[PDB]
């Protein structure tokens, strides 16, 4: 329960089109940043008893795991060898931080209690922690307005307006799936939440909760959710949950049962016996028909958001987004692609724009043309018999 961590993001100069206004704004960023760096360097360069006490402290402090504190100055600790000891307790510890399972610090020679290390989170989870601020705010999310509204109600509003719900006793949703075809914005709508959310964001990948050591997966999951609850009123983004989410079956192998165990621990965390704090789960998947009702349940996953292949208006707005930063030719009408009802994803629109720019560059030009868009679509698109209907 340390409190929210979130991420540090510098301000975003509003202009994108190459402009002296953009230059001026970005030089404003530069000058304040240089000023911060100055203050740091200046003050920290321009500008006893505890020193000797910490010297007495064993220099190569080891880490054990406390077990069954006894008395006031004699606590039992362990070691990373399977052995354990009835070690002494010095006068340097704050005390009251020593609880069973606590990763304690110990002296190399004396093997006493010389610390508590109330900071031990597994590397496999701290690396997954998010501290960058990916610049994907809710401006490049063409259309998808209903999905963004739902996700905003789920994630933002019980942080920036915790009065609507308390006014009427209702409690905010705890989980949201984003499910759909290959390329719709299910990950952009997570990136933008990371951007505008002042709460900690936690990457997660389903293929990351499957661990080699038997029983380690349903401990990594506990570590993940304990870090989420302890460290922040946060958000946990399990991308590609179909990596562990498949329906539980009887199975006849060890690995499948272990994966199912990881699922069960995830479910116990989402809605177990005890409770859940202010951790909001955002899950992503390409197929929702291949998941366990256990995790698709509306107690752990209170909202489900389809991401259907964007319609005509959304597709228009997506070309708008992904060509805005390009030198367009006046002879280009961004409707030839719109009108055709060929399955076009948001990623497909992005690839069309990129490929079109490339064809122009090959034509020795730096501004798109209608023929270039036509060739780009034709050479980008990847993939009922006639007359069976009508």
């Amino acid at each position: 329960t340390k409190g929210p961590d979130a991420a540090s993001k510098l301000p975003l100069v509003t202009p994108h089109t190459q402009c002296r206004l953009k230059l001026l704004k970005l030089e404003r960023i530069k000058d304040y940043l240089l000023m911060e760096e100055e203050f740091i360097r200046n003050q920290e360069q321009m500008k006893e008893e505890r020193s000797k006490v910490d010297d007495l402290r064993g220099t190569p402090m080891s880490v054990g795991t406390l077990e069954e504190i006894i008395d006031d100055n004699h606590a039992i600790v362990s070691t990373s060898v399977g052995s354990e000891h009835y070690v002494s307790i010095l006068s340097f510890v704050d005390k009251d931080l020593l609880e069973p399972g606590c990763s304690v610090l110990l002296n190399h020679k004396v093997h006493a209690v010389i610390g508590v290390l109330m900071d031990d989170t597994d590397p496999l989870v701290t690396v997954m922690k998010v501290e960058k601020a990916p610049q994907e705010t809710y401006a490049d999310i063409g259309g998808l307005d209903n999905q963004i509204q739902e996700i905003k109600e789920s994630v933002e509003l019980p942080l920036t307006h915790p009065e609507y719900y308390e006014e009427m006793g209702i409690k905010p949703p705890k989980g949201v799936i984003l499910y759909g075809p290959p390329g719709t914005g299910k990950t952009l709508l997570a990136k933008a939440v990371a951007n505008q959310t002042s709460a900690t964001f936690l990457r997660v990948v389903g293929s990351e909760l499957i661990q080699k050591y038997l029983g380690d997966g349903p401990k990594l999951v506990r570590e993940l959710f304990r870090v989420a609850e302890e460290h922040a009123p946060s958000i946990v983004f399990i991308d590609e949950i179909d990596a562990i989410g498949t329906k539980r079956y009887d199975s006849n192998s060890g690995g499948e049962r272990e994966i199912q165990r990881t699922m069960l621990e995830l479910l116990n965390q989402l809605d177990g016996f005890d409770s859940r704090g202010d951790v909001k789960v955002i899950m992503a998947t390409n197929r929702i028909e291949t998941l366990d009702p256990a995790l698709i349940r509306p107690g752990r996953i209170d909202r489900k958001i389809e991401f259907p292949l964007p319609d005509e208006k959304t597709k228009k707005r997506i070309f708008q987004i992904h060509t805005s930063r390009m030198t367009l030719a006046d002879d280009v009408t961004l409707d030839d692609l719109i009108m055709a009802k060929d399955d076009l994803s948001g990623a497909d629109i992005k690839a069309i724009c990129t490929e079109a720019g490339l064809m122009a560059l090959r034509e020795r030009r730096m501004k798109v043309t209608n023929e270039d868009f036509k060739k780009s679509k034709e050479n980008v698109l990847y993939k009922t018999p006639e007359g069976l209907y009508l």
Binding site: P182, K350, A351, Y382
Partner: protein, 51 residues
């Protein structure tokens, strides 16, 4: 295969005519060919043959 992870998808069609000739030359340079070897004729005699 989404155009977000694999952006471009090149195809390698079975060498057509005179592309088969190019491959014949490439893999027959380090060789001892007589005056009167027609790598073109070899190409036609090889229809639809991969590299």
């Amino acid at each position: 295969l989404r155009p977000g992870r694999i952006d471009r998808k090149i195809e390698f069609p079975p060498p057509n005519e005179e592309a088969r000739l190019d491959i014949l030359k490439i893999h027959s340079r380090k060789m001892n060919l007589t005056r009167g070897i027609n790598l073109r004729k070899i190409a036609e005699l090889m229809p639809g043959a991969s590299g």
